[PDB]
Design a protein around this ligand. Structure first.
Ligand SMILES: CNc1nc(C)c(-c2ccnc(Nc3ccc4[nH]c(C(=O)NCCCN5CCOCC5)cc4c3)n2)s1
Lengths: 227, 228
């Protein structure tokens, strides 16, 4: 029932296989490495997930019973990790095909310019995720475990740990019912490292300042830098 | 010129002699775990940056007129040019055909000993060293250009006019020197700007990772150069 709730929240947070949008998709991308249009698209694809990941989190049983300050800190801290995990899972790295939570489908070369090298690190992680063959219930727990985790400055870190423990127990109980758990849990630290390169990319783009990040992305960037 | 002689004296006294080179840490083939670093690699990176800053401070003090600029303008010019000057002097000093980095202390390090602390940036600096060496910039021309990288317009100068006059004088000194032995050297100054950005990206990464914290003086240059 926790599991059922987590699966409901996951499946309601992404596009139906029918609401997929191939109208912008380019099978072969023309030759011709960074313009204002590329930076705008990068911030737009990031910003497309903000509202979606907040509504998903609010359907995680227990999440709305954390303090409003802890809810905000967990969302800000996990935003990039959750954006990458959900993109990695949804996408088709065998075809270099990125599927965004709007249902927009883009080839890697159509967003490489905004993303920089990071998009190739994200596709490598997507290919490693796909090889584990994570079933939707397992992924509905894992994604919740990315958000519901210790972060510096939590008001009720013990209640965050207890909710994490419940979701971890829900996941272990599910993987047993169908060494493989620890390969799943192994993807969490890899996701943390991957999203360091996301923070590196935003730093570079703010230095370059072709187009500034929209306020909410800028705040996540500034707030998650320990300095 | 008298200015030229002073600029050449300041330049030559700010690095090692082909005789005061410490091969004491040099190893032609180390075997590193690439794309990773330990506390020792990050501390040495910051130590080389700190040593270069102290050396570039004494060098600037010997540029005639620099020490009479306001103390605040001296600090702003040094902070704003530091990374540019570190890269330019390292590229000019180094031996990229042997993968040899030569630091202002005279310390010689192989490319492979620098890869852990510096990351990609050390390989981009050696590529710039190859482009610089193929221009065959004579010592006096380099002693002028390096001074022109420091003594330039910056946002927040108290006496921008005195900095422009000193710039004007060093430019005149340089033009009258190239004429005295008779634009390509100055088309790699944008390449040098890119290498500064890479330097800032590497410090950002290392501050994120925080194995050891940056020295306060380097940290201030980093924070003061970022518009945010
Ligand atoms: C602004 N002030 C300054 N300017 C600089 C850069 C300074 C400095 C401080 C100490 N030593 C030196 N100079 C130095 C020392 C040793 C050197 N060896 C060579 C050399 O062999 N090259 C030949 C060029 C051909 N390529 C090199 C080999 O790999 C590829 C081909 C130059 C050199 C310069 N400068 S303080």
């Amino acid at each position: 029932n926790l599991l059922t709730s987590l699966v409901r929240a996951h499946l309601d947070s992404g596009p139906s296989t029918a609401k997929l949008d191939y109208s912008k998709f380019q099978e072969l991308v023309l030759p011709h490495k960074e313009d204002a249009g590329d930076v705008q698209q990068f911030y737009d694809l990031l910003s497309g997930s903000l509202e979606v990941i907040r509504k998903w989190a609010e359907k995680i049983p227990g999440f709305a019973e954390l303090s409003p300050a802890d809810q905000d800190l967990l969302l800000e801290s996990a935003f990039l990790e959750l954006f990458i995990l959900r993109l990695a899972y949804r996408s088709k790295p065998g075809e270099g095909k990125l599927i965004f939570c709007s249902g927009l489908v883009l080839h890697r070369l159509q967003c490489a310019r905004g993303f920089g090298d990071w998009i190739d690190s994200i596709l490598a992680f997507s290919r490693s995720l796909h090889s584990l063959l994570v079933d939707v219930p397992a992924f509905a727990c894992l994604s919740a475990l990315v958000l519901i985790t210790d972060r510096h400055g939590l008001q009720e870190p013990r209640r965050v740990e207890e909710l994490q423990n419940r979701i971890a127990s829900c996941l272990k109980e599910h993987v047993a019912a169908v060494s493989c758990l620890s390969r799943l849990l192994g993807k969490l630290p890899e996701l943390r490292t991957l999203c360091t390169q996301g923070l590196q990319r935003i730093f570079y783009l703010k230095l370059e300042d072709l187009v500034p990040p929209p306020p909410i992305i800028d705040k996540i960037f500034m707030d998650t830098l320990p300095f």
